[PDB]
Design an enzyme around this catalytic site. Structure first.
Site, mmCIF file in Angstrom:
data_model
loop_
_atom_site.group_PDB
_atom_site.id
_atom_site.type_symbol
_atom_site.label_atom_id
_atom_site.label_comp_id
_atom_site.label_asym_id
_atom_site.label_seq_id
_atom_site.Cartn_x
_atom_site.Cartn_y
_atom_site.Cartn_z
ATOM 1 C CD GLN A 184 3.123 0.359 0.854
ATOM 2 O OE1 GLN A 184 3.280 0.688 -0.321
ATOM 3 N NE2 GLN A 184 4.041 -0.314 1.537
ATOM 4 C CD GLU B 260 1.716 -5.404 -2.630
ATOM 5 O OE1 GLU B 260 1.561 -4.817 -1.539
ATOM 6 O OE2 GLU B 260 2.546 -6.322 -2.798
ATOM 7 C CB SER C 204 -1.197 7.334 -0.636
ATOM 8 O OG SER C 204 -1.376 6.473 -1.748
ATOM 9 N N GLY D 94 -1.443 5.221 -7.602
ATOM 10 C CA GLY D 94 -2.444 4.832 -8.574
ATOM 11 C C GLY D 94 -3.711 4.281 -7.957
ATOM 12 C CB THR E 25 8.106 8.006 -3.493
ATOM 13 O OG1 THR E 25 8.287 8.211 -2.087
ATOM 14 C CG2 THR E 25 8.406 6.560 -3.840
ATOM 15 C CG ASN F 85 4.964 12.263 3.431
ATOM 16 O OD1 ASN F 85 3.954 12.178 4.120
ATOM 17 N ND2 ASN F 85 5.269 11.373 2.495
ATOM 18 C CG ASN G 249 2.254 5.894 9.600
ATOM 19 O OD1 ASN G 249 3.079 5.017 9.356
ATOM 20 N ND2 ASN G 249 1.690 6.631 8.653
ATOM 21 C CD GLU H 293 -21.830 22.206 15.240
ATOM 22 O OE1 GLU H 293 -22.582 21.532 14.504
ATOM 23 O OE2 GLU H 293 -21.907 23.448 15.335
HETATM 24 N N1 LIG Z 1 3.150 9.478 5.445
HETATM 25 C C1 LIG Z 1 3.017 8.354 4.752
HETATM 26 N N2 LIG Z 1 3.014 8.384 3.372
HETATM 27 C C2 LIG Z 1 2.879 7.237 2.665
HETATM 28 C C3 LIG Z 1 2.747 6.029 3.326
HETATM 29 N N3 LIG Z 1 2.635 5.055 2.402
HETATM 30 C C4 LIG Z 1 2.684 5.614 1.177
HETATM 31 N N4 LIG Z 1 2.849 6.962 1.322
HETATM 32 C C5 LIG Z 1 2.932 7.923 0.217
HETATM 33 O O1 LIG Z 1 2.325 7.325 -0.910
HETATM 34 C C6 LIG Z 1 3.082 7.554 -2.076
HETATM 35 C C7 LIG Z 1 2.999 6.349 -3.009
HETATM 36 O O2 LIG Z 1 1.734 5.727 -2.937
HETATM 37 P P1 LIG Z 1 1.557 4.419 -2.023
HETATM 38 O O3 LIG Z 1 0.624 4.690 -0.873
HETATM 39 O O4 LIG Z 1 2.910 3.980 -1.530
HETATM 40 O O5 LIG Z 1 0.949 3.277 -2.975
HETATM 41 P P2 LIG Z 1 -0.618 3.244 -3.321
HETATM 42 O O6 LIG Z 1 -1.305 4.505 -2.863
HETATM 43 O O7 LIG Z 1 -1.246 2.028 -2.692
HETATM 44 O O8 LIG Z 1 -0.662 3.114 -4.921
HETATM 45 P P3 LIG Z 1 0.096 1.890 -5.638
HETATM 46 O O9 LIG Z 1 1.580 2.069 -5.444
HETATM 47 O O10 LIG Z 1 -0.225 1.882 -7.111
HETATM 48 O O11 LIG Z 1 -0.325 0.588 -5.003
HETATM 49 C C8 LIG Z 1 4.503 7.810 -1.604
HETATM 50 O O12 LIG Z 1 5.077 8.872 -2.324
HETATM 51 C C9 LIG Z 1 4.378 8.196 -0.146
HETATM 52 O O13 LIG Z 1 4.662 9.565 0.007
HETATM 53 C C10 LIG Z 1 2.742 5.995 4.709
HETATM 54 O O14 LIG Z 1 2.634 4.925 5.297
HETATM 55 N N5 LIG Z 1 2.886 7.161 5.423
HETATM 56 MG MG LIG Z 2 1.036 1.354 -3.598
#
Ligand SMILES: Nc1nc2c(ncn2[C@@H]2O[C@H](COP(=O)(O)OP(=O)(O)OP(=O)(O)O)[C@@H](O)[C@H]2O)c(=O)[nH]1
Ligand SMILES: [Mg+2]
Ligand SMILES: Nc1nc2c(ncn2[C@@H]2O[C@H](COP(=O)(O)OP(=O)(O)O)[C@@H](O)[C@H]2O)c(=O)[nH]1
Ligand SMILES: Nc1nc2c(ncn2[C@@H]2O[C@H](COP(=O)(O)OP(=O)(O)O)[C@@H](O)[C@H]2O)c(=O)[nH]1
Lengths: 152, 71, 48, 433, 50, 430, 430
Positions: D11, D65, D134, D138, D173, D200, D222, D248
């Site tokens: 995500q 997802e 991220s 997971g 989170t 973050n 973002n 480089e």
């Molecule tokens: N800076 C930033 N961090 C994000 C963003 N989306 C998710 N995160 C970070 O990702 C962590 C959780 O993982 P997610 O990316 O939300 O979910 P995922 O990586 O797809 O893994 P699943 O939840 O199992 O589907 C959070 O603690 C956030 O800090 C984003 O759009 N911008």
């Molecule tokens: Mg996720």
């Protein structure tokens, strides 16, 4: 001269000021407004979708009930989205449920088992007059939409 | 990549412009345009702040509108 | 590394939703505002 | 002739690639529908002509997802991306690294690699791959690990870069994310060429202090990462007085193969309310770039030595002023370099001024600098993640959720050991001779 | 000039009077079952066809 | 910023807070419906000190009202400006106090104070950066002098760093309002002296004298008394809410006023105060204000300050005046009456100036003094207590719910000792 | 995709579902006739999660109503929204269980369960991608607490990879509605701990306390109680149906909330809830939302949370808000109360955001907290069960359908071991 008064600017009570009226949706000009997109280009709720790309997943309404015949997935989606119905109330029932007794639930024959029959015909959700051949429907010559017109 | 501009602000010179320059007499690196150049660019630069200020202020007012409605 | 903190700080055991005898009371000067007595003398360095 | 391929998973990866691709289209003048309004080959780095009009990006989106991908295909950019390169599964891994590395990612990895082949065969001068993921999620961590391991053998010596987003030291989170973070770090250590830290909290502090926004959102973050990526990559699609490429970076910033984690900074980041109410000279912007509180990663460089610094200027900057600023930076005492590095500066200059996105926050300035530093101070985040991991692993909490998905119970042990060996290498390099 | 149209309250200007027709105390605050509760006065409206 | 929450208990506290809150609302230009209608911009800069924020842009005070009987709050709710306070801010019992310190401090207050503690602690964590607490109560009553003191102790073990102020209405025997007042007074003072950071004492006899002689009005009322003490309350904290030449908050006042921790009892006064038949003959100037502050009768305590020596004192001026006049008048008064000031401290007067006068006036001033003359009240109450305790009268009522005579002995001994060191400093010389 | 089916049994479960389907139909804009009336595209995108599509453009809930007696079903059919449910989905006996766990779990429920198992299998096979099942029932009643749990076991040991969520109305002893509540409550919990993935306990007494103290409405009823439960039910799966900043499904909550397999008993809560006399005065902000979320009186259970330490917490926010404020407020509430959070698992709170708020509000909060304080309910239930079982009261009634007391001993030992091991982690230290 005169004594001390409490209320300044002569503010009249919200109690007796006019009467309530229908602006329940005053704030919900944008209540069904996503922000994943949205607030990137626009600030008003998105218009209903008319076209979808292949593999769009979630629930295009038309397809499943009445099996749509051989045609492109996007074509079927566009047709069953641009078709009428899928909205508007002939009965005018509200989604809340406060209006439930406005309309009495009727199903528009006299079943009689005294001598014969009693099976009763089917509901008015099946076709008539539209009985027409498949080769006819599929095979027309040019009196269609132009496949590649799109005026510029 | 490429080196199209000798410096950011000015392009190369036309062949007619470079008439002599075999002897190290004209280098063109002396500007004779530096002060007026910075004086000009600062004005347009303040303009960018000026327009940005209205953009942000309108966004803030639009935000406050929503709270006014919800109240 | 340490970040010593003085008056207010931010760590507490019983801040927001903590709370679940006639014989006992405060005897003489256990209160902070009482006890008109001062600590002991230290020569001290200053110059560092 | 030169192209880079973008990989977005998770995500976070999707929601940052969105801002990146909006910025790229705006910078190259491509309308959201994909064609130049209605009234130069530099775009070729990111895009490719279809022959007839529109341009398709050289990127791929992955998720399990379907909500995010469905939202993309419903958005206004629906006509831009190829319909069958936004790969979406059916069941989310649910913050479980084992699910995304052993159970459900293996049925999607084949389609992803097929798409990567069909996209890479088109290009002829492939520079490398960028990946966004991220690390505390997971599916993100598991799929990132799987793709990196597959690509490392499928292509070999092609350059790969990872813009990882590590969990913050104190605010976060999820509650199970240290396990996934450690496992993913073990995976990426021997499989990524370059890693960049993007936690973050640092960006939160930057936005609060400088943007003067008391209630920021993920979109602002973002946009910042998108701006950083654009500043990094502008040197392949714009003319410059002194040019740098992806190749480089590993030739100037990697003293040893194990040491490839760097942390970034940007300057200037000033709100338009006071943006040009200072001169924004090259000296002050490059000083603010090195200021410790500006760093894009929540780390203090004053606690360690500097290994190498790569700085990219874009705009109206001039090499003489660059060198003048470098002299002052070297003169300054608060910052010191490691013993075996006499000069550690690599400088790139580009003439394209940064572009501003409507609805954005930053002000469009004539001059900007983006800095990437490899330093010995990076060990602190690994140390604190190490403590957090061992605290829970002492009592075997949550271990069943990973044991039951096909993961061997001892897999944690060698990841823990590899982190220990990473501190081995870093603190061993950091000492003087 | 702008003289004050009304009395500004000061230690010797309020001048309260307790000569009313009748002094009755209304029971507003109610505690039932160890729960505090209040009468809904100043909130009642009358009627409408809604 | 550095806001303060208000809590009050008992009939006295409820009435005093009722008057003080309408005073503050008038000062800040707030209507009875909670909507700002003021004219100047300065009235909204520091409004968060006493008022929170609500939806629709309205303000509510951060006040808590506590009682063992809802009669007083029930009476006050129907009064003017009664709609500002919130129902969750009212906490009330169902049994009453019976003018019994033990009843209000051990058996019903103990089981009732949990809710008010929750409310006040919720407000404290809600506010951004708390400055401290102020209390208003009388020591001659049961519920006040018991529950307020117990709450003071409890909040003290939880916020040791914040400042604590009390407005204490001590009973003077000539206005004999309660036969069992010595027990409550001595126990309450004993509990207070080790917890409260500042206390300022108010005497109903002093208020009566002020109303009779200075204002010279025929029929004073408890409304007038409460309005006097409320003006005194607002005078000390005006500087925290409005700009001035020299800023001074309660912490600075305490620092510049109390030399030793065991001496934190003050006697207060307000100026100017004039009758309707004497406002045409009196001129309004800094010399007049500085003459009226130090007048013995103008003091808001039964103690006569000219029977003792001032330890420290402070003055808070309101309006636009000159530091010239302020400082020269203060030096003049400190030099011409050297016998009334203790010798081992020169310039024992603090001065502060705020530029916003009270509405309808040009200049005002509030005087707060720590002087050794308050020992008269303590000595008199101690002799009353020991004379009426020698025969163990009324003692069974206090003993019936677990209390013991040893605590009485300890409290009276502590009060006597406090009198001893409080007097020995009067005769001290350098 | 990833849709779920609804199963409800007993009169309590039927009454819960009667309002749950009502509120879901309101959220998705479905009329009592089943025709779509939604106002944006969002109310139709993911509607397949709860509703099946029928020819003619109408919608049918995927719910199975399952019971030994038809009175409640025939009563609930006649109400509004009573026409949605398919007539085939009703399965009902002719006798009833008489609040016997034995009758509701062995003699008649097992005979009837073949048809309901067939229909559930049909519904599960028809839908493409299962997410899980959710059940609503009461543990104080025979037919529910037996036959619903037997169905739970049967469904689990057929679909072990699918998630199972249960809403259990456990009976508080202060207000007892059945005299044999300990027996069947114990027998139900013994079976539930072995098969249910998540159990969310709901206390009628707690709902009663909330209805008096927060809403302050004079005459609440089972309709309002059911509506509260339904709102809490929908708050869990809202983000599964609407896009948001961070999606979070049932499997994610399960992974992130249960440290150990047998500790899956949750207490939930919903916010904001304010009286109509105060709706205009509270200001909707994240600090107020979290303060009311973590309040002790807002919990949906009689277990007082501050009697133990939170093992894990989870918050689901509905609306559009800055993740700044959510994260920083959560960090602050975690730091300010270090005593009540177990220390060997740092950062023991998970958060999620969904973009679509409940209709008529901008912000809402649904909280699920796994805490050690719930052991009090088990302790009290076990105490009552053993006191009543020591004299073998009412025992012949259960033994008269083939049951033996050894099952009672086995179940009570299971609960005792669960309580002991559940308290084991409370005092654990690093
Ligand atoms: N800076 C930033 N961090 C994000 C963003 N989306 C998710 N995160 C970070 O990702 C962590 C959780 O993982 P997610 O990316 O939300 O979910 P995922 O990586 O797809 O893994 P699943 O939840 O199992 O589907 C959070 O603690 C956030 O800090 C984003 O759009 N911008
Ligand atoms: Mg996720
Ligand atoms: N100044 C002032 N004094 C008051 C007021 N009400 C009561 N008192 C004094 O307080 C004393 C009685 O206090 P009491 O009512 O028993 O306190 P409680 O037990 O806390 O309610 C009397 O001597 C009164 O003079 C008031 O409104 N203003
Ligand atoms: N929340 C709620 N609880 C209910 C309702 N009806 C009954 N109950 C609870 O259910 C318990 C009795 O359950 P019972 O009728 O024996 O369940 P059954 O055996 O399945 O029919 C009582 O303690 C009630 O508190 C309802 O409509 N709502």
């Amino acid at each position: 001269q005169y004594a001390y008064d409490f209320n300044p600017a002569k503010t009249q009570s919200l109690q007796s000021r006019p009467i309530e009226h229908n602006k329940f949706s005053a704030w919900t000009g944008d209540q069904l407004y996503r922000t994943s997109y949205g607030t990137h280009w626009t600030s008003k709720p998105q218009e209903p979708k008319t076209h979808v790309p292949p593999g769009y997943a979630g629930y295009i309404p038309g397809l499943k009930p009445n099996n749509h015949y051989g045609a492109s997935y996007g074509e079927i989606a566009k047709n069953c989205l641009s078709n009428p119905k899928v909205a508007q109330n002939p009965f005018k029932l509200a989604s809340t449920g406060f209006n439930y007794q406005r309309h009495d639930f009727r199903d528009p024959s006299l079943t009689a088992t005294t001598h014969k029959f009693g099976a009763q015909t089917l509901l008015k959700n099946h076709p008539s007059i539209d009985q027409k051949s498949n080769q006819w429907q599929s095979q027309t010559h040019d009196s269609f939409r132009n496949p590649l017109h799109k005026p510029n | 990549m490429k080196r199209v501009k000798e410096s950011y602000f000015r392009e190369h010179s036309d062949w007619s412009d470079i008439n002599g320059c075999s002897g190290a007499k004209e280098f063109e690196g002396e500007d004779l345009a530096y002060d007026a150049r910075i004086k000009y660019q600062k004005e347009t630069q303040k303009q960018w702040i000026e327009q940005q200020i209205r953009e942000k202020k309108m966004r803030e007012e639009a935000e406050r509108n929503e709270e006014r409605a919800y109240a | 590394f340490e970040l010593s903190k003085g008056p207010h700080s931010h760590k507490d055991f019983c801040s927001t939703f903590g709370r679940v005898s006639t014989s006992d009371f405060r005897k003489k000067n256990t209160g902070t505002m009482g006890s008109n007595k001062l600590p002991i003398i230290k020569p001290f360095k200053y110059a560092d | 002739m030169r192209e880079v391929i973008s990989i977005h998973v998770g995500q976070g990866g999707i929601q940052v690639g969105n801002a990146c691709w909006e910025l790229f289209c705006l910078e190259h003048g491509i309308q959201p529908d994909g064609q130049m309004p209605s009234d130069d080959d530099a775009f070729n780095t990111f895009f490719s002509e279809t022959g007839a009009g529109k341009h398709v990006p050289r990127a791929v989106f992955l998720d399990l997802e379907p909500t995010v991908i469905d939202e993309v295909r419903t958005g206004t950019y629906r006509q831009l991306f190829h319909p069958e390169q936004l790969i979406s599964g059916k069941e989310d891994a649910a913050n479980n690294f084992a699910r995304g590395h052993y159970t459900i990612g293996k049925e999607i990895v084949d389609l992803c690699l097929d798409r990567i082949r069909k996209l890479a065969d088109n290009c002829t001068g492939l520079q490398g791959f960028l990946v966004f993921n991220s690390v505390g999620g997971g599916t993100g961590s598991g799929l990132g690990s799987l793709l990196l391991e597959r690509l490392s053998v499928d292509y070999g010596k092609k350059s790969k870069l990872g813009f990882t987003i590590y969990p913050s030291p104190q605010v976060s989170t999820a509650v199970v994310e240290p396990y996934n973070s450690i496992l993913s770090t073990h995976s990426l250590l021997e499989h990524t060429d370059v890693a960049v830290m993007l936690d973050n909290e640092a960006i939160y502090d930057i936005c609060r202090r400088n943007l003067d926004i008391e209630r920021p959102t993920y979109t602002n973050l973002n946009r910042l990462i998108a701006q950083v990526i654009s500043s990094l990559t502008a040197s392949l699609r714009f003319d410059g007085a002194l040019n740098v490429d992806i190749t480089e970076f590993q030739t100037n910033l990697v003293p040893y193969p194990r040491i490839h984690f760097m942390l970034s900074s940007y300057a200037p980041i000033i709100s338009a309310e006071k943006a040009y109410h200072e001169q924004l000279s090259v000296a002050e912007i490059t000083n603010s770039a090195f200021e410790p509180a500006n760093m894009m990663a929540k780390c203090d460089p004053r606690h360690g030595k500097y290994m190498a610094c790569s700085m990219m200027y874009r705009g109206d900057v001039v090499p003489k002023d660059v060198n003048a600023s470098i002299a002052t930076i070297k003169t300054k005492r608060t910052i010191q370099f490691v013993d075996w590095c006499p000069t550690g500066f690599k400088v790139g200059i580009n003439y394209q001024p940064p572009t501003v996105v409507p609805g954005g926050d930053l002000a469009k300035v004539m001059r900007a600098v983006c800095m990437i530093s490899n330093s010995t101070a990076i060990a602190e985040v690994f140390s604190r993640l190490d403590h957090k991991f061992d605290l829970m692993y002492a009592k075997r909490a949550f271990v069943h959720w990973y044991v039951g998905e096909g993961m061997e119970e001892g897999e944690f042990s060698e990841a823990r050991e590899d982190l220990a060996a990473l501190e081995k290498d870093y603190e061993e390099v950091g000492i003087e001779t | 000039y702008n003289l004050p149209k009304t009395v500004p309250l000061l230690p010797g200007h309020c001048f309260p009077d307790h000569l009313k027709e009748s002094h009755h105390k209304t029971q507003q605050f109610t505690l039932v079952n160890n729960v505090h509760c209040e009468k809904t006065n100043y909130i009642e409206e009358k009627n409408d066809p809604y | 910023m550095r806001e303060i929450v208000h809590i009050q208990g008992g009939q006295c506290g409820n009435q005093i807070g009722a008057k003080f809150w309408e005073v503050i609302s008038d000062e800040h230009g707030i209507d009875p419906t909670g909507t700002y209608h003021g004219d100047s911009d300065l009235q909204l800069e520091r409004i968060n000190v006493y008022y929170n924020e609500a939806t629709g842009g309205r303000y509510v005070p951060r006040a808590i009202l506590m009682d063992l009987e809802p009669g007083t709050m029930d009476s006050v709710r129907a009064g003017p400006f009664g709609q500002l306070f919130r129902p969750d801010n009212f906490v009330f019992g169902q049994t009453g106090a019976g003018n019994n310190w033990a009843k209000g401090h051990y058996t019903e207050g103990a089981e009732l104070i949990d809710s008010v503690l929750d409310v006040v602690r919720k407000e404290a964590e809600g506010c951004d950066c708390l400055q401290g607490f102020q209390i208003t109560h009388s020591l001659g009553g049961g519920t006040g002098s018991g529950m307020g003191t117990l709450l003071i102790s409890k909040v003290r073990e939880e916020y040791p760093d914040r400042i604590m102020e009390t407005f204490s209405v001590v009973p003077s025997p000539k206005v004999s309002d309660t036969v069992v007042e010595p027990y409550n007074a001595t126990l309450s003072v004993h509990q207070l002296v080790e917890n409260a950071d500042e206390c300022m004492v108010i005497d109903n006899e002093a208020l009566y004298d002020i109303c009779f002689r200075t204002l010279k009005l025929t029929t004073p009322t408890y409304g007038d008394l409460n309005h006097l003490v409320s003006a005194a309350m607002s005078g000390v904290t005006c500087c925290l809410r409005f700009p001035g030449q020299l800023n001074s908050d309660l912490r600075k006042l305490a620092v510049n006023l109390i030399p030793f921790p065991r001496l934190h009892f003050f006697m207060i006064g307000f100026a100017p105060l004039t009758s309707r038949g004497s406002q045409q003959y009196r001129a309004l100037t800094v010399p007049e204000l500085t003459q009226q502050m130090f007048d013995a009768k103008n003091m808001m305590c039964a103690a006569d300050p000219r029977h003792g020596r001032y330890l420290t004192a402070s003055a808070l001026f309101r309006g636009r005046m000159s530091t010239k006049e302020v400082d020269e008048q203060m030096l003049n008064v400190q030099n011409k009456n050297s016998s009334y000031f203790v010798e081992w401290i020169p310039n024992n007067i603090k001065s502060s100036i705020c530029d916003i006068p009270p509405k309808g006036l040009k200049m005002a001033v509030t005087f707060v003094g720590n002087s050794t003359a308050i020992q008269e009240m303590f000595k008199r109450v101690a002799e009353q207590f020991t004379a009426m305790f020698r025969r163990k009268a009324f003692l069974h009522w206090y003993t019936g719910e677990g209390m013991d005579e040893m605590e009485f002995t300890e409290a009276e001994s502590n009060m006597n000792d406090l009198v001893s060191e409080y007097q020995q400093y009067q005769d001290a010389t350098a």
